[PDB]
Structure 1
Amino acid sequence: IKQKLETQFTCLFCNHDNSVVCTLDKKNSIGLLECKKCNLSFQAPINSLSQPIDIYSDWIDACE
């Protein structure tokens, strides 16, 4: 079953903190970051061990 989790991460674009939601679909190995404020979305591959800090880390490197 999918996991819809709220986090305390800051969006890299709109800078609103505590407004990034992480949807981890392990059945298809696809993780999804969403911003509850400005509405952006970032997708990245996840394994079985990953957690909201794993894809949020991949989002920091995808920008820089």
Structure 2
Amino acid sequence: LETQFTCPFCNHEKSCDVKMDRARNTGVISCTVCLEEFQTPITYLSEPVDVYSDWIDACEAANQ
């Protein structure tokens, strides 16, 4: 699987890093280039793919 994803805001490949704070059940995805940050709830089954997913979904929902 992939842990570094392309940022939906600046389109920089592999510029997004994902941090899984399991103790607080929160995943934080941050772009290194444009410094955009997003926080989502996560479960023990969650992965950086699902944090990256929740971010894309939040973007598309907010852009409606």
**TM-score, structure 1 as length reference:** 0.85
For 1:17 and 1:7, the matched residues in 2 are separated by 11
Task: Please give the per-residue CA displacement for 1:4-32, whole angstroms capped at 9, x wherever unaligned.
Answer: xx833110101101110000000010110
Match of 1:3 in 2: none
Match of 2:6 in 1: 10
The answer (yes or no) to whether the contact 2:4–2:18 under 8 Å persists in 1 is: no
Q: Which runs of 5+ in 2 are unaligned?
A: none
Match of 2:15 in 1: 19
**TM-score, structure 2 as length reference:** 0.85
Bigger strand fraction: 1
Match of 2:39 in 1: 43
**CA RMSD for the aligned pairs?**
1.3
For 2:4 and 2:39, the matched residues in 1 are separated by 18
Runs of 4+, deviation exceeding 2 Å: none
What displacement does 1:55 show? 0.8
Bigger helix fraction: 2
What displacement does 1:34 show? 0.6
Q: Which runs of 5+ in 1 are unaligned?
A: 1-5
Of all paired residues, the percent bearing the same amino acid is: 54
